[PDB]
Design a protein around this ligand. Structure first.
Ligand code: QMQ
Length: 354
């Protein structure tokens, strides 16, 4: 288990000792256990724990996750995390301070891309998302996030000047589509596509879904959605369409560009209907008491809705990725990823006949 540098060890020890109750309060520095869960320059994660020989005094956790930010948004993100914790839809919040958070450590692993298509996994994600979508949050209810964000990235993308030859050639090719005009065409399409405004996760990818340890038996209760940093009131179609897009991207791929894209992994009509068939009863509650006529019309229109909004997933994350090619320190093939998203966008446009 990778040890942090002595300084980070000492800081982590002091936060745990001061924010956590019970046996943590009298812990000595020499008794403190910590290891790295994820390095990097931002959102460093560590597991912190009591010695195995140390007894708890009450209901304090034996193990916690320390999240360190590194290099209004903090207020919103913080309040949102605390509310989800109170409602048991996220990890408990044990401590909050300018440099990070102490969270409940959830014994689990992330799902892999291939698991998204498993019937039981997909059905639970649908149910979890419908729950997420149904609740009240003290945030702006106007759906300006989607196009406001897309405009913001496009404005930045148009200003970008690369110096390295590969990035230069790639940006040229992406620019050749006339993105401002394409954004306008997308805007018009989505304007004519009704979709309820709900509290969306906005990044429901496999890496943000935990498979809970000790619960492979549980058909319906084995997942937790995490990482709500992008969450906002947004069109329901975006959340679902974005999730469907994520079937096609595997970020665990070990060589450059550090992802694999496969267009044929997008869910089939059957797979899509299985997802929405689980979503709709969880979101509407009495949905199954409607006529087969009405149920089918709702389902068919919803397929249209989410598949059109999947275009915005491609366009938004495509633009985002170009910006990250300029600003991010992370080892990821951002320009290659942007091209993959735009390739999918035009493919999806062709499939839809739009
Ligand atoms: C915005 N989009 C569409 C992107 C963004 C980034 N990428 C590239 C990329 C995606 C995913 C990854 C892997 C993400 C790792 C994040 C992570 C780390 C640890 C965990 C485990 N975890 C989190 N909280 C807890 C917890 N509280 N308890 C136990 N385990 C936990 C979950 C998720 C790396 C690069 C692609 C598309």
């Amino acid at each position: 288990d990778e040890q942090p540098e002595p300084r980070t060890r000492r800081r982590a020890y002091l936060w745990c000792k001061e924010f956590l109750p019970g046996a943590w309060r009298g812990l000595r520095e020499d008794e403190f256990h910590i290891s790295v869960i994820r390095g990097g320059l931002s959102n460093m994660l560590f597991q912190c724990s009591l010695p195995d020989t140390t007894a708890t005094l009450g209901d304090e956790p034996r193990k916690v996750l320390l999240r360190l930010y590194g290099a209004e948004a903090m207020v919103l993100e913080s309040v949102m995390f605390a509310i989800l914790a109170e409602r048991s839809l996220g990890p408990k919040l044990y401590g909050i301070f300018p440099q990070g958070r102490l969270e409940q450590f959830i014994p689990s692993r992330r799902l892999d891309t291939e698991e998204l298509s498993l019937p039981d996994i997909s059905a639970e994600i649908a149910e979890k998302m419908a729950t997420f979508h149904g609740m009240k949050m003290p945030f702006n209810k106007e759906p300006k996030w989607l196009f406001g964000t897309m405009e913001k990235y496009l404005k930045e993308v148009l200003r970008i000047k690369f110096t390295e030859e590969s990035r230069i050639k790639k940006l040229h090719k992406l620019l050749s589509y006339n993105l401002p005009l394409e954004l306008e065409n997308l805007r018009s399409l989505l304007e004519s596509t009704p979709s309820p405004v709900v509290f969306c996760h906005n990044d429901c990818q496999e890496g943000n879904i935990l498979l809970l340890e000790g619960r492979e038996n549980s058909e319906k209760q084995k997942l937790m959605l995490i990482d709500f940093e992008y969450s906002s009131y947004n069109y329901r179609g975006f959340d679902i369409g974005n999730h469907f897009c994520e079937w096609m991207y595997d970020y665990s791929y070990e060589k450059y560009p550090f992802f694999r894209a496969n267009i044929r992994k997008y869910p089939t009509k059957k797979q899509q209907l299985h997802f929405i068939s689980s979503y709709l009863p969880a979101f509407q509650n009495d949905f199954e008491n409607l006529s087969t006529e009405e149920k089918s019309i709702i389902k068919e229109e919803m397929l249209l809705e989410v598949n059109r909004f999947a275009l915005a997933s491609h366009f938004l994350w495509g633009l985002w990725s170009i910006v990250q090619a300029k600003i991010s320190s992370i080892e990821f093939g951002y320009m290659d990823y942007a091209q993959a998203r735009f390739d999918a966008y035009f493919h999806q446009k062709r499939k839809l006949g739009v």
